[model samples]
Target: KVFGRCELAAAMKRHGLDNYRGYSLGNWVCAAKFESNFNTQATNRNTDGSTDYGILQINSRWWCNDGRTPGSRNLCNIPCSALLSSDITASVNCAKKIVSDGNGMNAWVAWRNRCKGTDVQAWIRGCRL
Candidate 1:
């Protein structure tokens, strides 16, 4: 399980990541919702045999590894379990690296598939921040 959107937003604000590289908090929150519903333990095995980890759904093939895939690059330089932590510092850090290195939010399949151009205002609906 994970925190609520407002709680997540508060944490993001505390970490000064509310607007990372110009992507709004709503964008991040919305992506999180679609990817893992804000749950840290959320994981899914893709059809390609790659696994997605954590709230942001970082991929095993590109960002992290499950120690089973040969030639896994592990671009995030962290174990896949690190993303399953309730303390999102590690996940957020790796996510920043991913977006910074890739095509921003579009790098996330959830963002491109469901959140792009969608009204995400409700993601931050009641957060005083």
Candidate 2:
């Protein structure tokens, strides 16, 4: 299920992303827009052989256990497939773990390159959330 703009915002907040680790809801919204366009089933295989899963594109290298990424930490202790689900709870929880792990939102290059230090509020502009 692909999410609409305000819907994603409310979901992020409902799942505890609002001002999490000092990152705003807009920051998350912007990152999700660039990462997967709010698509729950989004996945991307990296050139380094790691696959990124779900909306935030959580990586198999350190975040999820896909059974294909050798030596993967599975730091979130979640199956990579879980990230692809429409519920997004697993994805959101793992995202918080990513921030808590000291990487903050920098774990996503798209977040750094696109959403970082910019007017991220524009990502949620006119949203009634």
Candidate 3:
């Protein structure tokens, strides 16, 4: 698994999000477990004709559009197709920035709530299995 508890913790710490309202290492582990099963290679197709990629399941086109285009490897030097090809630290750090900038956990919750049949905020707030 590319984005396990350790990855989440690293991401949170790197982004200075270790102090999220009600977040903890276990909470992160549970969240990741529930969301993507700690699989950094996880991905899902969106109704908008785009794809969510990697362990954190970030939207390749939305956040890292570098390689979204015909033959471009957008931002980060790594192609969107190779989302998990990057190092765990790099991916986690990317997740940290995305989440810290109000797009990470918050966005994931919103997606889960709206699309995956779950309570967005409550999930991020640390819901039980």
Ranking by TM-score: 2, 1, 3
Which numbered prediction scores highest in TM-score against the true structure? 2
Cα TM-score per model: 0.93, 0.96, 0.57
| Model 1 CA deviation exceeding 4 Å by range | none
Error of 3 at 58 (Å): 0.6
Please rank every candidate by lDDT, starting with the best: 2, 1, 3
Query: TM-score: which is higher, 1 or 3?
Result: 1
Clashing residue pairs in candidate 3, if any?
40-55, 66-73, 66-74, 66-75, 67-72, 67-74, 99-104
* Model 2 stretches with alpha carbons more than 4 Å out: none
lDDT of 2 by residue, 1-129 (tens): 899989899999999998999999999999999999999999999998899999999999998999898877898999999999999899999999898987789988999999899999887788877
Give one digit per residue, the lDDT tens place, for model 3 in 14-115: 655454643444444455665566777777876765666765666655566633434323344445556665345555555555656654456676334543
Q: Give the TM-score of candidate 3.
A: 0.57
lDDT of 3 at 38: 71
Each prediction's whole-model lDDT (CA) = 0.86, 0.92, 0.54
lDDT of 3: 0.54
